[PDB]
A paper describes a structure:
The proline-rich antimicrobial designer peptide Api137 inhibits protein expression in bacteria by binding simultaneously to the ribosomal polypeptide exit tunnel and the release factor (RF), depleting the cellular RF pool and leading to ribosomal arrest at stop codons. High-resolution structures obtained by cryogenic electron microscopy demonstrate that a large proportion of pre-50S states are missing up to five proteins (uL22, bL32, uL29, bL23, and uL16) and have misfolded helices in 23S rRNA domain IV.
To test this hypothesis and provide direct evidence of Api137’s ability to bind to the precursors, they were incubated for 20 minutes with 30 µmol/L Api137, representing a 100-fold excess relative to the ribosomal fraction. After class identification, states were grouped into d126_(L22)-/(L29)-, C_(L22)-, C_(L22)- ~ H61, C_L22, C-CP_(L22)-, C-CP_(L22)- ~ H61, and C-CP_L22 classes, 50S and 70S classes, and pooled again to increase particle numbers with a specific organization at the PET exit pore site. In the (L22)- states, Api137 showed alternative C-terminal trajectories. The fragmented cryo-EM density in states C_(L22)- and C_(L22)- ~ H61 suggests that the presence of Api137 may interfere with the binding of uL22 and uL29, potentially explaining the defects observed in the L22- route. This interaction potentially blocks the incorporation of uL22 and provides a mechanistic explanation for direct inhibition of ribosome assembly by Api137.
Residue numbers in the entry:
A (entry chain D): 1 to 126, 161 to 209
B (entry chain N): 1 to 102, 104 to 120
Write the structure that this text describes.
RNA sequence: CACAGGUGGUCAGGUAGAGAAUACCAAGGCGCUUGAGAGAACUCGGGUGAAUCCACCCGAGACUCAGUGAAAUUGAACUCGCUGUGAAGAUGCAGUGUACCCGCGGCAAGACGGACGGCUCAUCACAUCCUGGGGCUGAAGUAGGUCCCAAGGGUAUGGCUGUUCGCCAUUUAAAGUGGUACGCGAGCUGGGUUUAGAACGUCGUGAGACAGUUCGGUCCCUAUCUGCCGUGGGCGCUGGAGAACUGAGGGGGGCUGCUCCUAGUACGAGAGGACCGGAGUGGACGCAUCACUGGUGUUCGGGUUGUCAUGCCAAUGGCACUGCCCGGUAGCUAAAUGCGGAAGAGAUAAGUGCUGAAAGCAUCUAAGCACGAAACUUGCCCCGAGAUGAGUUCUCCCUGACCCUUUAAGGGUCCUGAAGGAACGUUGAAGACGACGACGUUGAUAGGCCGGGUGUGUAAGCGCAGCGAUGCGUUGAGCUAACCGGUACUAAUGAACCGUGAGGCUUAACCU
RNA sequence: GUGAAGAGGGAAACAACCCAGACCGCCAGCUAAGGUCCCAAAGUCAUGGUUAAGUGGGAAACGCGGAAGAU
RNA sequence: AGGACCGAACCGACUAAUGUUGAAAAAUUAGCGGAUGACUUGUGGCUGGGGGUGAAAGGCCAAUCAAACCGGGAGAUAGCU
RNA sequence: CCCGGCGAGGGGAGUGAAAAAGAACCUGAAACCGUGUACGUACAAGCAGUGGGAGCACGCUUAGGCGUGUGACUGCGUACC
């Protein structure tokens, strides 16, 4: 349906009642507010633009400030797009919480791999080329716990990238 | 490697690097002013500021540690008596770097001195 | 060559040392000929300063490795793929397709780079071999021959023949068959020949040659472009600029063993015996991480042998592979795993099918008209409008003046200098160099500091006991680089350059 | 007979295949082989025939089949 | 007393690598071997080119040996580019 | 005399017929290295030339279409011994 954008902070382990250790990743998911709505009539397809975080007004470029003021929302750190599933349509300025993933139990995480120096053929394939600064998508991941008041989301296993990176969580298409 | 790493490559023997750091720290504490490249000035500041902060408190253990890390009786004698009280009320930032113009494209140079350097 | 190579005798100290050996010291000699620059005349725009005569530095053009500078080669190069011909794989002949121009880092499909022979894991067929896994061969065993992701290009003995050798025999883990110049004689070598010395003699006017003689022996060079991967400078998408996406096209992988019941059901006289692929459970390989399971972590602590020093001890620093070990911060890895190679869909060979003949039978098809193999494409992960067919969406800015001509996609001057970028500093989980994220006084970007965390282990001093060693309270103490949240204590100041000033021509619809 | 010692036009390319022996110049007209959908200059010209397989646009013997050809 | 053993200086290139317009027209690095004996070295001299020498590789004779350099025969030479 | 560093070197003035004769010194072309003048080139495939061919600045009959440099495109085009 629609995915949110969060920030990686760290990763640790979680202990269950039965006494089982499961790796988890600390992801802070700020409430993403819709800024622009693209429709078939005008834009040619259905989509919603989501912004997260905040930036100092000094560094915000005037075109970006005007675009944000058009939607009447605070300027964030970036913009992301998600393709709708022909479901309910949102409105500009509609804040989106993390409750959507509270009843899915299956999500996919997309991130950016950490940069690395040139790697040999054996290191990469076991062809030389640039390592890092590339996409990484991991699917079939189940959310462990969801905290609405804390905006903290936990997923089994590790996630791509290092601390401070920006990741995207989407509903698990595979089923 | 390449991730959350502190300190430049500085290709050389570790003992030689430590000796150079000690020599530059001694020169700075003696003359209170040096001219050197920006990486070298930053390394000197990083290696000397802990010593100055430790010297703020006057004690036998602190003096012995300063002598061990400097190997100069005169330098330690100078310390704990003038620099300490001078920067007693200042927490951090005991050294300043001033750009003295130029190489520009080969290796930069700058002056590293104390906050006051006099009085 | 001031070369890195060679040059005969004498003076021969201390410590732990059997030793002129080993490690550091006495007197003495050195820190090495690449590691590192000034402001480089001049020229432009600026701000600052006593009101002509100007003085200071920035942002630039003008040097750059603080640099002389050689190297085999070179008919001229604007140096793409496939198909066909060709003294025979055509960058150059004919047909067709693709590609913005110029650079940088790696990998060689191959340039017939340049001046016979086999030792060949990377793209190939036979079991290829710089030392992963396998399937079959009534294989008596080992072993051959047949096949996969694949090219040990350093190596046996021999018949046909000349030896490693082109067919193969014994082959073991291969002694091995051609594609690419058998990838390189820009690797090696001769092991027989035309070629390192003998060598019967030859075809052969002669050159040229005799994959014929018995033994054979010394074979040269510092990536030129080109194909692929990644990454840069310029320009264009038509006023400029900042962001976010659709998408023509392109990238790589679809492996495989067991069990639960389903069900000892169907079918089947009995024996026999699934479809079930419904769920879980292994291995090879790909992405990602360090909390867990091992290493490194010459930047951190502790122990210890010799030696020099701090005037001596206690205690430290320098050398002996990091002098030798116990570990180990963060980071980097696998010896650890969360996921992946789906499920499903389309069209499929064979096959399986609703009603149904021509030609009162039959039949997968003639009329209406449906599934389906690990084959193909979507579906899974993507980049991508340099796709010049140059896309879509949102946002920000310029609203001046005058003169001239060859009177129009015209030219010139003063002023303005927008959004955006670059210029410089802090810098990073970005990095060979480019490039990219965040900050620059409207601040945690870097250094240090505060408290915590990890690591290491009981630091020194003090008084007591032991007439030595050493222990006791001080003390779970001291120290801690890269970890966590703040602190402007210090460094990113006031700024300056490019980038504009209403955006070409023709046509259809709105009030003029 | 050609090349050897001959240019040019056609066969998509080509030296032996077909026409054709270039003194030079001119923005002229007519032929030979070969073509008259385009590429490329010329009739999408007229009549009588074979062709449902792209045989044309590659094939022996043999009873339309034979028919499998080169990144 | 050892053509004795380990082990410095020293000697041999026996093995591997460095380069084949090189640092050198044959050298360098790391091991191996001898290290009181057929040992080595400083200096002086003799053995001379169809010859000398040669514990027989036809090794060496001025960075070259199946017969070295210089000037003359020779502006040589049958065949050939 | 000035710049330059109190050097080297350069720029003026003067001597010099001439310094387009300055001790690298008569006359001074090419291969090679830079700047300016005009043009082609960032959607375009092969011995790089040959004819056609729109423009870009200038001088001409002071237009009446000529020449000084270029060809985007197009038919042809496998260098020499």
């Amino acid at each position: 349906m629609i995915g949110l954008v969060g920030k990686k902070v760290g990763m640790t382990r979680i202990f269950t009642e039965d006494g089982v250790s499961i790796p988890v990743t600390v992801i802070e998911v700020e409430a993403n507010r819709v800024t622009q709505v693209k429709d078939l009539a005008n834009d040619g397809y259905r989509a919603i633009q989501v912004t997260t975080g905040a930036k100092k007004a000094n560094r915000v470029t005037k075109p970006e400030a005007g675009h944000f003021a058009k939607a009447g929302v605070e300027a964030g750190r970036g913009l992301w797009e998600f393709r709708l599933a022909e479901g309910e349509e949102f409105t500009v300025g509609q804040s989106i919480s993390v409750e959507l993933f509270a009843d899915v139990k299956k999500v996919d995480v997309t991130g950016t791999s950490k940069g690395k120096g040139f790697a040999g053929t054996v290191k990469r394939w076991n062809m030389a080329g640039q390592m890092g600064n590339e996409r990484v998508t991991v699917q079939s991941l189940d959310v462990v716990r969801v905290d609405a008041e804390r905006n903290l989301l936990l997923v089994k296993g590790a996630v791509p990238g290092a601390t401070g990176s920006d990741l995207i969580v989407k509903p698990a298409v595979k089923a | 490697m390449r991730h959350r790493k502190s300190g430049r490559q500085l290709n050389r023997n570790s003992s030689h690097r430590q000796a150079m750091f000690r020599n530059m720290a001694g020169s700075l504490v003696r003359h209170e002013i040096i001219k050197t490249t920006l990486p070298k000035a930053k390394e000197l500041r990083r290696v000397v500021e802990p010593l100055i902060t430790l010297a703020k408190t006057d004690s036998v253990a602190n003096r012995r540690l300063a002598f061990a890390r400097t190997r100069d009786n005169e330098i330690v004698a100078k310390l704990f008596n003038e620099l300490g009280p001078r920067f007693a009320s200042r927490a951090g930032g005991y050294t300043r770097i001033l750009k003295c113009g130029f190489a520009g494209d080969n290796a930069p140079m700058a002056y590293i001195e104390l906050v006051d350097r006099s009085e």
